[PDB]
Structure formats: C-alpha cells, structure tokens
C-alpha cells in the first residue's frame, strides 16, 4: 500500500458515504448544527421600499456518524479537505431575504476525526426591515436576522451557538467604521416557530442596532435652516412702507421655496413618511405664510380712502381681538381767495392719510411673538432630540 | 445488515426509482397535487408597468407510489428526508409571470410510507396586475395569481386545495403590517381552462385584496392644498387696486405652479391615469385662470379713457349677461379768469375716472361664488371617497 | 413481467436513443417543425433605444423516428411524458433578440406512439424594433418577430405552421386589454434566407401591428394647449398700455416655459425625432417671441421723441411693407405774459404725444391673423391625423 | 449492422474521442481557427463610462483530426452535426470586454469529413471604448475589438480568416439602417501580443468607424440657439430708456438661463468633455454678461448728478480707451420776481440732465461690434465642422 | 501503442487523478501559490455608496504532484493544456467583494513536467473602498485589495509573488490613460490574518494609488465661480439709489441660485460630505446675503422720516462699532406772503433728506473689505491644493 496519506484517507472515507442521509446512526438523536456571525460592512440602507444590504461572515459546525477514522493509522493526521458536493450540508437559509444570491460558494470543507465537520462562506443579503423614517436626523434601526431550518423540525435540526451570546453581543473586531452607519449590538436570541398545531421548528433571531453619523448632514441641512431664520430678522417694522415689504416677502417665499424641491428631492421619501423636521419646516412655512397675508389685507385695508373703517364695526372687532389675547379789484381779491382754499384741501390730506398706520405696527410685533415661541419650540425639540441621541449609547 | 436504519431504507426506495415516469400505477387514474400559499410581505407595487412584486410561503403535496414501505422492518421509519433532484416533481408554474427566479431551491423533500409527498418552497414573484389608478387616496386593488399545469391535463393533473377556503382566506398570522399596503381577502377558486376544442386543462385562481394605508400620504398632498386655498381669501375686493392685484396672482400664478412640477413628479403616472384630484386640481386652476383673465380684461377695459364703452352696446352686453344669470388792468382780469377754467377742468376728472369702478366689484363676487361651488363640490368628492374607503373593509 | 405500463415503456423507449443524431432514417429527407404563437400582454416599449418587451406562449411538434411504438403491447397507452433532457430538441431561436432569457424551462415534453413529438413553453422577449416616433399621440407601430435554425440549412429543418394563416391574424383570446397598447394583426409569412452563394436557410416572419390608446394622455397633454392658446385672447389692444401689455408677456413668455422643461422630460426623447405635435408647439412660441419683440420694438420708437421718424424714410417704408402684404405795472403785465407761454407749451405736448400710436394698433391685428392662421393650420392637421388614426383598424 | 446511417456515424466517431485533447496528431503543428464577423445593430453607445453595445453575428472553422470518416463506408454522408459539448472548443475571447455574457449557446456544430468543423454564434458584446465628445454634433467614432486566444500561444492557436479583409472591409446587408448610428468601415488586421520576454500570442483587432446621424439633433439644439440669436437685435439704442433695458435683460438672463439646465441635462455629460459649441455657448454668454455689467454701471453713473465725473479723470479715460481701440407796491413787484428764478432754475435741468447721454450710445455700438464678430465665428466654426462631416466619408 | 502523443499523455495522466486531494505527497508540508496582477482600466468609481469598479489580469502557478512524467517516453512534450475541471484548483477569492462575478471562466489550464500548473484569468470586481470626498476637484485615492484563502490555514495554503515588488509596483504597459483616473503606484504587502488565538491566515494587501485628471472638471466648474465674481464688482457706490440696487441683487440673489441646484445635482453627493469648495462656496454666499440684509436694513432706516434716529443712541452705537473695527390790498399782500412760507417748507426738504446718506456710503467699503479678504483666502486655499495636487506625484 504504497500510497500518499490523503489520497488514502479519501479513498476510505468518499467510498460509499451516499450523500442524502442525514448523517446520523439512530434516526431518534436529531444532529445540531452550531453558527456564528460576524458583521463586516453595511452597503445600502434604503428607506423607498424597506431594503437593507448586508455582508457578513459565517460559519457551521455539524457533527458527523460516517467519516470517523482512527489517526493511528493514516499517518497521524487530524484535519482533511473534502469538497462540499460529496457530504450532506444543512439547508440553513435565512428568513426576511429578498434577492438572495450575489455571493460565491465555497468548493470546499474541513473535517476532523469523529465527524467535526466545518464550513466557513460569506453572504451578502438583501433584507426586509422595517425602517423607521421619524427621528431622521439621529434614528437608531432595529433589524432582524431570522436563521432556520426550511425543511427540518426542531427534533431533526437544532441550532445552537459557538460562542457564547456575550462574546458576540460585542464584536467590532473586523467591522470598517468608514460610512455613515455605526454598529452598537448584535444580540442573539434562540426560540421555536410553531404555527399550526403540528409542527415545531427552531429559529434563532439575531437583533441588530445601527445608529447614523449624522455630523456631515447637519451642517448641510440644519446650518441653512438656521441661517434663513434671519428673513424675519430683516423684513421689521415698516407698515407705511410695506410696498418695499411686500416686494421682500413676494422674492423671499421663492427665494428657498424654489430648493425645497430638490430638499425634497435629497429626502429619502418613505410612503409612512413623518419626520419631526419635516412637518416643523412645514408649519414654519404655514405660520409666514398666513403672517404676510395678514399684513397685506392689513395694508390693502389702510392704503385706500377705507380708514380702518371709521363705523363701530372695528370697535367691536378690536374688542373681540383683546379678548382673544386676554369791478376788477373785486375778481382780484376773488381770485385771491378762490386758492386758499385748494392749498389747505391740498395740506390737509397729509395727516388723515398718516393717522392710520398704528394697527399694522401693533399686530406685526404680536406675529414676530408667535414666531420667536415657534422657533424656540423648534431648538428645543432639537435640543432634545440630540439628547435623545446621545444618550441612546449608555445601554 | 448491520447498517443504519436510515441509510438502508434510502438504499432500498431509490435503488430503481426512475424519474420521468408519473408515478402511478394505472395510468388511468390522474395524480393530485395539493397546494397551499401563506403571505409574507408586498415589496413594490409599480403603476408605470404593472408589475407588482410579492412574496409567498408554499406547500405542496402530492401522492406517490413506488415509495412505499412498511414501519415494520426498517426500525419504526416513518418520515424520511430525500434529495430533490432523485424523484418526479410536477411543473405547477404560476401565470402572469414577468423575471420569475430570485427564490432560491430547497434541495430535499418529505416522503411518508405509502407515498405522501411534501415540499416547501418560497416564491418571489414579479406578476402583472392590472392597477387602476382611479381613487388613488384611497384604492382597493383586486390582483390575480394563477396555478396551472403548463403541460398536462385535467387527466393528468389535478390541483385541489390542503385546507378549506375559510381557513385560506383569512390567514395574516405571517404578515407583516408596516408597509403601505394591508391585506384584506386571500380568496381561492378552482375552474377549467380550455381554449380549444381539445385540450382540458386545471386552474386554481388566488384572487388577492389590498388596501393602501394613505393617512401619511394625505398630510403630505392634501393639507397643502386645503391650505393654499387660502389665495382666494386674501387677493379681495380691489378692481381700483388692481395693480397690486395683478401682481398678487401674477406671483401666485407661479408659487404653486413651479412645485406642481414636483407634485407631478411625485405622482406614480399611468399612460392610463385619470385621478379624481389629478382632474380637480387641473379644472381648479383653469377656473381660476380665466377669472384673473376677466379680471385683467375688466381692468384694462376701465384704466384708459374707454369709459366702459358708453355706446348702447354695453347695454346689450349687460342684458344678455343678466338673462345669462337669470390797458393793463384788462390783461389783469384776463389772467385772472384765463386759470380757473383750468382748475375746474383738472379738478373735474376725478369723479369722471372714479365713477368707473363699479362693474368689476359685481363681477367678482359671481367669480367668487362659482369658486365656492367648486371648493364644496371638491369636498363633497373627497368625503364620498373616504366613505367608500372606510366602507370598504366591512365585507 | 410484473411492472407498471409507464415505467416499462420509458425502459424501452430510452433505452438506447442516443441524443445528437438527427431523428430520421435516411439522412434524405428533412425533418419539419411546426410552430404556433399566442400573445399575452405587452410590458414595456422603450422609444430611447428601440427596445420592445413581450410575452407570448409557444408550441412547437416534431415528427420523431426512433419513438414508435405499437399500444396493444404496453397496455393501450397513446401519450406520454418524458423529460426533455433525454431526446432531441431543435434550436428554435428567434432573432432581433436583445438579453434573451428571463423564462424558465419546462422539463417535459408529450410524445405520441409514431413519433409526433409536441412541446409548450412561454418567451418573454426583448427585442429591437424600429419605432416611428412620428404620429406621436396616434401612432401604428409594425413590428417584426423571426423565427430559423441558427445552425440548420432548408435541407435540414423546415418551419411550417400548425393552424392556418387566418385562424392565426385573428387570435386576441388571451390578449388582456387593460394596457396601452391593443393589438391589431399577426401576420405569418414563409420565406427563404440566403446571403452568400452556397447556404439556403428556411425563415418564418411573424408581423405584430400595434396601436396606442391615447385617450389619456391626450386629456394630459393637449387640453392644456388648447387652454393655454387663450393668452392671446387676453393680451389685445393696447399700444398706449404697452408698459403693462409687456408686463403680461415677460411672465407669460415664462409661465409655460417652466413646465416646457417637464413637457421635454415626459417625452419619450427619441434621437430620429420630429413629432407633429413636437414642431408645430415650437414654430407656435417662435411666432409669437417675434410677435412681442416687433412690439416692443414699436413700443420702444414711438415712447421717445422720435414721433415714428418723420423723415421720408418710414414713407419708404410703409410703401414696401404696403407692397408685402399686397414802471411796476409793466413788470405786471410783462410776469402776465411771461407763463401764458409755458401753460401753452405744457398743453400743446398731449396732442403730439397722442398722435402717434396707430402703428401698433395697425400690425397687431395682422400678427393676430397670421396667428389665427397658424392655429387654424394646427387645428387642421390634428383633425387628419385623428381622421387618419381612426381609420387605419378598418382593415 | 441494420442501422441508421447518422445513428452508426455518431456511434463510430464519439466512442473513443476524449475531450480536452487539442486535436492535433503531432504536437509540433499548431492547429488554425479562422473567424468571420458581420455586423447587425447598435444598441448604446453610453458616453458617460465609455460602453459600447454591439449585436454582432460570428463564425469559426477550425480543423480536426480525430474526425474523419470515409463517406463510401456510411451510406455517402458529408455533413453531420454533434453537440458542442462532445468535442474540444477552442478558447477564443474577446478583449475589453464588461460583463460579457447575455447571449445564448448553441447547442450543436457541423463536421465534414477531414475534420472542418464549423460554428455559428451571436455574440452581445459590452466594450470599452475611448468616445471622444468633442465634435459633438458631427463625431466620427474609431472603436476596436480583439480577438484572441486567453491561454494559448502562437505555436498553439493561430487566427486567420475566413473571407479575403476586402470582402470583410464593406458588409452593410443585414445591417439595419434606422438607428442614430451609421456603420463606414470594418478593418481588420493581425498582429503578434507580447509583453514579457517569454510568451508569444496571436492577435485580430477589428477596427469599427462609425458617424452620427445628427439631421434631428440640430433641428432640436441649433435652431433653438440661433432663434435666440435675435435678443441683441430686440435690445438696441435705448441708454437714456435703460430703465426697460434693465427690465428686458434681467429677465432674458434668465429665460435661456432656466432652461440651460435641461440643456446640461441633455448632454451625455463626459468627464473628459469640452464640446465646442458647450465652450461657444458659454463664451456668449459670458460676452453678454460683461456687455451688461458695462450697461449698467453706464448707466448708473450717467442717472445720478454725476454728470460722468467732468474731472480731467475722465479725460485721461476716454484717451486711454482710444488707445486701446487705436409799500405794498414793493412786495407786489418782489413777489413778481422770486418766483421767475425758481421757474429758470426749474427749466434749466432739462438741457444738463440730457447732454450726459453719448457714453452709452458709443459704447453700445463697439460691443454690438464684438457680438457679430462672436457670431461670425461661431457660424464660420459650424460651417467647417459640417464641412469636416460631409469630407470624412469620402474614404 | 500506435497513438498521438497528446492523446496518450492526457490518458495516462488523468487516469486515476481524483480531484478534492491537496496536491501532496506528505501532508506536512504546505504548497504554494504564487500570484500576479496587471491593471487594465478603472470602469467607475462611484462616491456614493463607496463602489469600484475594476478590470484586472491574473496568474497563478502551483507546483503539483500527481503529475510528474518523463519527456523522454511521451515523444518529447513539455507543455500540456487540460480542462480546469479535471484538477485542484485553490480557493484564492479577493476580500472586500460586492457582487462579484461578471467574469468568465478559463476552461483549460496549462501544466509543465515536474507539477507547474499555470492559469491565466480576467476578474472584473466591484470592491468596497473608503473614498474621501473631501479634496473633491484633486484627490488622491489609496484603495486596497486582499488577496487570500476562504477556507485554508498558513500552514495549507502560502501566497508568495512570481516577480519581485519592484518590478510590480510600476507597471503601466496595458493601462490605458483616457479615462479620469490615472494609475500611480501598485504596491504589493505580504502578512498574517489571525482573529482568535487558533487559526493563522496568509494575506496578500495590494495598495492601489489613483489620481483624478481634473482639468475639464475645473473649466466647467471653476471658471464660472470666478467669472460670477464679478457681480460686487458690478454693484457698488450707490445707497441712494438702492432701488435700483435691491433691483440688483434681487435678481443675482436667484440667477445662481437657481443653478445651484443642479450645481448639488451634480456633485457625486456623499453621506460623509465635506468639499473644500462646497463649503467656501456656502460661506460666500452667506457673507453676501448678510451684507445684502445689512444694506437693506440701512436703506429702510434712511429712507424714512427717521433721519438715522437722530436720538443719542447711534453715537452710542457707532461709539461701540469704532471700539468693534477699532381792504383789499391787505388781502393782496397777504396772499402774496403766504405763499413764500410754503415755497420755502417746500425748498427745505432736499438737504434734509440728502444729509443722511452716508453710513451706508461707509460701511459698504468694510463690507467690501471683508468680501476681498474671503475671496483672497479662497484664492490661496485653491493655489496651496493645486500645489499639493502637483507635489503628490513626486514620490
Ligand atoms: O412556510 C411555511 C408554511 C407554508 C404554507 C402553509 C403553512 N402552514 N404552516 C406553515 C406553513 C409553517 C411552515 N412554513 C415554514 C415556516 C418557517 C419555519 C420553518 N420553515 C421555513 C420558515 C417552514
Ligand atoms: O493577462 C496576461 C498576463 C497577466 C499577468 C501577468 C502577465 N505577464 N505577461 C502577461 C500577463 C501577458 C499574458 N496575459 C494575457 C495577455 C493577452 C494575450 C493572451 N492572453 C489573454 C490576453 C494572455
Ligand atoms: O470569516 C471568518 C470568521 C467567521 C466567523 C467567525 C470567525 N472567527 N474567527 C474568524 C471567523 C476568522 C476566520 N474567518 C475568515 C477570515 C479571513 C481569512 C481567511 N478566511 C477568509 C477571510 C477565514
């Protein structure tokens, strides 16, 4: 028997192992095949349609009843090559999967005397995972991973783990932290799926936790906002000028109102889509909006012979407001009087149309009140959310 | 024969288990296949093309019979797992399929003694449903999922159901409820296609119902146009001041038109799309169009010396409008009597240009109320929708 | 002899069929193939880059030689099923095939005792089609579908039709008529494909009509022209007024070329295009930009103090333009006298300023004929092509 | 020995014939594959990462050794066809190629006696190719591809072809002419690749020439451009009425400016991209810009009380430039009196306020000098690229 | 033994070489393969999902022995091609992988006496590299490749290189330089992969250097940044006619503005985002806008009866901005003085008013101030990139 020690083990062990059989002695024992998981890099989280793009690393273990050898014999070996179409491999596949498929197969398997058979294989999966939209700027993303059996019933293939549940819970060891999502936890957790009343099937989920960086999108989404809350700043008391006014607010209210077309555009929209940003910006629009209208009804109220209409209707309408907030010498001397009277027509109409500018100037100072609580309401919601945020990392 | 059980039992069924045959024994009697189909999830629901992509749970069973075997002998056996590829599988393929694949092969199978044969599969399939854009805020969709036999017959094949209609038709114990689409009826059917004079062929229709969730859509389309209905509101009242009219809606005009590119964008269009608020928002805005174009045509009629054209024809304009709605001291004197007929021609004009006014302050309020028509006929539509939408779910 | 009818006879038929050889006795004669081809729906027509995707079911029999059988034998059998792997299968392709594939396999196929040897399967098919953009909102498209042997010679493998030409043209059973387009006509046609001098190859061209529904999308596209050709309706008469009359245009010139750009991005962009539509909508704006700039140029002469150039120039002119169309008291009197002079100046520029606006008020009415003209034309042209568009299904 | 002559000629030369061989009987000799490629369509030419998608039709005829038969023996055979896996192929791969693939297998080739084996094939191939943007409208496209041999070397494989390089230079019969594409020439040419100072390889660079179609480009992107080549004649002599200027070029700036975006859009935009008309485009506007900065600050110094700076500085200006372009009676008779100085000072603005307007009107003439010497040479530049289009065909 | 050498060769050869065995004959020591890679072209570098795209060559040559034979017998071959699937083939798979494939496969392999078996291969991958954005218009990449066994210890599998680093680091020969990216240094590193404290793992690190040619990227980028620089130039020195100013900037304020947005659509938008450029450019023109706030400000306090609030709070406010920069004749004359009075009121207005137009006048200079400074630090920021850009390629 002059023969290599490999070529030898291979013919004795591949003879006739028929591949199909679950590899066991006593159809009662059912096998356990143990697995672990470590997270490499996340490639794509799109919001549109609940996608997650995934890449990991992987690894099972089975024993084995027919490729027991004594190492005596084979010349003292203790680990063999075989490739991974001539034994019988488990039909883990992972719940949750869209597309699946993208990765290579690995020809080949390791085993060990006694029937330590293991396998190493990567695997880029397409994921459903119900993302959540609110909380844009600082979400923090719950996922789920679900591992069984298609086929087999909790006394036929049961899952276990290599490690135990803390040594995996924190593993960042091969993890790149070069894109704009960080990992926080993987925990592992094992129960059994049973939905009718026949049968029984195990399953191990494991809950990933993702945060966003969200350094690089603040600066370009929140420093514009901040710095165009100074057009309330500008546009300030000017009633009787309000043709200037109007001329400011008519270019102001397209002047961002032309880019929010492309924010919202950059937004990744989600059909149950309601950020806390996005109805702020909204109502914030809503209450300038409805500001210039009130200014302009005002000053189209005041610019024409109305008078704030003299007649006590705006008494009442004052009053209600309150309670709410709680024979040549002869033509001579004829045409020497006839003018007095046009001159003091002409001079007296200065001060009736200048007596009627005060209701402007005093409602604009009680819409400049409702907009500073409004924006102090929004750096508090911000304020709170950022503490929100940070404190999510202590657990 | 000291071998596993298992293994000699896998020994003894495929030893001369041929594929290709139909197993039966007669070939006079057809073979049944039963099926069952559990929903998971709705990944996109496409109106450009039709193409709506789902994702299933399956079962399949049907009787065999060259493998049967008794307990007795081969230790107690009585369910046994077999490699996929070494027996007769039936060609159930699904109709309305477009790019069918994406869904991975389970490579084994049931088998109990006499011949009962499972599998499961899943299926994620791109079919073709004819979606009616129509009530788009709140559409129920009524897609269709066909199985068939591509090849054989009624004689041959026929397909039945594992459980009973009820069962299959309520069934959401699987389904996830956070996308924008819910279940409501899984409804199954089993008739005949035949298309010939020849050929029998079995069909087994699931006839699937869907509702889409639309409360985050309306916050987001709706309330900016119940909103911006506000624009009637505050341009009111000023045929004299129709300047600054004219520029109110000459800006207005635009504000909403330049985002109804987006909106339009926004809207999944359909080469057959006619949506109830896609027609409304249209006809809203020509209404509002040819207002401000009287209004401009009024205006332009009274700015020039024209005077509403005194000549009777502007008589029988308004007729048929109303049956529509059913040495020195001499140069001294001279002087002076030479500037008064000046003054009194300058002074005599303002009653004459302001005595004009009067035609578009009436025409106006007609506008207005054919507006409020409009809006109360808008909110009459919109309220009958969401009363069918809320009464569609009772059956 | 104790064995099923069914397993035995596919014993004895596979036997020693060897696949490769040609089925036939003597190499002389030439095997034929039928084939038959059903339409289903029609997914996606592409106009960027002539690209055509459909869906249709096939059929396709062999006269077979080496699968006879006599049924007393084996137990009255007639028809069976094999897999398709185990005999002889022709290399049916089509051409014009653009990413062929996208359709699964069946793994059966039915033959009959003497050799008639039948198949079923579904194409889904991408395909380059010559597509005429022109006759945009009423087009008829002719697309082609070749079916040969992309090895075999006329003497080899002959392609005929199941059914007759007829019963094939008019075949819209299973067509559903829900999407965009509706078929008309499948046309066969037998014919010979030779290109150099030595190899004769058989070729089947089955000619597909098809046409557009544009009900809805007419609605979309020219209703709002049709609306939008009332600006020259609103802006009439007014030289004087020219100051807002340019108001009116400077916007309008804008209004509609905003969404022009949307307009350009929902056609379906096509290097050889020339709509009908696509042109008039062109030279419409190009008439009317120099409509307003002869206008303005009018406006722009007579605003000033150059009175129209009374030199004999403008006589000139209009003759050519005429042809184309075919001790204290005597410082009294003296201030007396001093302002009669500046009052008649001041009143004697209101006549000159005046007297020069006829022009305008000439050419404008001859740019509204040539206006009214072109929409005519317009209006014409859209009559035929909907003339022509319903009479082309009268075949 | 009743059997079919096909079956008997199958059986006969398959029995012993290993595949993996390279057929030859002296390994000395090298073995020849010849090749034959034909052109069908294009499909895209994507500028944006230089793709090329091209449909080609393809032949190869290499001899063999191991199959010949004497056609006296087997019933006066002289062609046979055998599947494609039986037999050795010769590895022959296309160079620059990106995801090579989409394109079906033919399942059988032909054999004559003496070994001439044949195979025909469509190849779908997506190349790499070096498209240069400049000469946009008119561009002629130089592609290559190369075949050759992945592993073997040139006393090994060597490649030769089928027809004479002049029959294979002119071939346009099967190649359909209704694309934006035009085929010219189709030059092949042999050569030796090696690298190192060991390996020798054969190689067959085919090189492809190919024009556009650019008839319904320019009537879509040129006529547009020289349409809007009449602003300059719109605005012209107008410094004192620079209020309407102002008011025509503030809009125009914009009304060519919004849609420039689509323009851009449009463009098969190319990293390495400088087109000469998207170079000549921008220059103009450039021009127009500088010629309306000069414009207004014109007319910004003549419109206040400047009076065009009459310090001597503006001396040195002009002179520079020209350079460069080489009791109570008594207070009757006083009050007569005061009021004739301030009437004089009233009359006298008149004359200084319109003596300071020749600067504009000088100025306005040499840069309207500038633009038609800009015109010119873009017409000049258009004329001699057309003219570079029509001579490149005469080869 | 009257048979091809070839033919006898690969029978004695294959005959009972079963593939799945290391190549081996005493397990104790390890094989070797020894790889090679030359770059062709980089197909896209996409920033944002860090994706790239590459084509590279391959070798790789493993010594083996299993088959050892003498030239001497087998008439005097060297040099044999067998199928790929007839040997062992190593597990070398690239790490950093995203949908790799899209390649063929090589099915031959060449193999000498003795055991050297050589492959040659194509391999187009899709690689996750960390790409900085920051230094957009000249950054110098560094992205790295992993070369290594899926499956194999250190003590199975070794990585050494077939030519020396030297020779592999600066290898331009195929490369071809038209696309965006130009090849800078390929630099190969050998080391240990061990995680936990059992298994050791070769790796073979290539650092890859790319530059980006940006020349076309500036002309169309830069050069309207500069040219637009000129709009301060174009608005200066007029704060009594700010009407005419705020005219300006209203509009300036927009016509690049609305350019923006395509400019953003433009920019290959990454999560972690942060241009040199993209934040200057931010920056600008918040300074412009605040300066543009700052005028208006002043213009509406002048411009009304405020008179710069001659109260001394603005010597208090100025004070702190110096410390921050650090019978009937009687009614004749009567008449007669009664209208002196008013002439006189009327006559004093013009240099009240004009005396309060100097604040403005001053601070636009400081603001101009603070523009040069911003665009001068601009300036220098660009020239010291442009240096580090040229200075990166020294090494
Ligand atoms: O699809 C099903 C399924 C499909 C159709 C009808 C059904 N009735 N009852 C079940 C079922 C439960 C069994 N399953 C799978 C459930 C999980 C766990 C293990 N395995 C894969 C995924 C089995
Ligand atoms: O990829 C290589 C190659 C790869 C790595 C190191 C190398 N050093 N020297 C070469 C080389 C030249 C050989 N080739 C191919 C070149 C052409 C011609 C034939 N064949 C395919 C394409 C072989
Ligand atoms: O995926 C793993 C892996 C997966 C799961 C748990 C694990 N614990 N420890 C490791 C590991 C390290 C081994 N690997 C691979 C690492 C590199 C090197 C060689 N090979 C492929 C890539 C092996």
Redesign the interface.
Known sequence: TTQ????RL??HL?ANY?????P????RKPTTVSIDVIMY?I??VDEK??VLTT?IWYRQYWTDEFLQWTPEDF?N?TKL???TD?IWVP?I?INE??????S?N?????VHHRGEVQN???L?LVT?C?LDIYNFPFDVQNCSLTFTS???TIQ?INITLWRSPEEVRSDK??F?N???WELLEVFPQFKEFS?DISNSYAEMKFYVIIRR?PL??A??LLL?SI?LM?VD??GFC?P??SG?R???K??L???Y??????V???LP?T????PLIGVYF?VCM?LL??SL?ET??IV?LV??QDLQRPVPDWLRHLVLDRIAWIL??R??????????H??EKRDEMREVARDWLRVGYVLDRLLFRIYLLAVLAYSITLVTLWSIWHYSENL
């Open positions: 290599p020690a490999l070529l291979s013919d591949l028929k591949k199909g059989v679950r066991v002695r006593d159809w890099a490639l794509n349609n609940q890449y010349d070996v090559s075989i490739p001539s039909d596949l999967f869209v597309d699946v498929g993208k290579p690995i020809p080949y398997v390791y190493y294989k990567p880029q459903a119900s298609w086929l087999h036929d060891s091969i790149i070069q894109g704009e939905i960086r690089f999108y600066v370009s514009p710095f100074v700043i500008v000017l009787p000028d200037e109007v001329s400011f008519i270019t209210l397209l002047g109102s032309v880019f929010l077309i492309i919202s555009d950059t929209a059909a149950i889509g309601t909204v809503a909006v409805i209208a302009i009804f189209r610019h024409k040549a010498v033509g001579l001397l004829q045409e020497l009087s006839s003018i007095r046009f001159l």
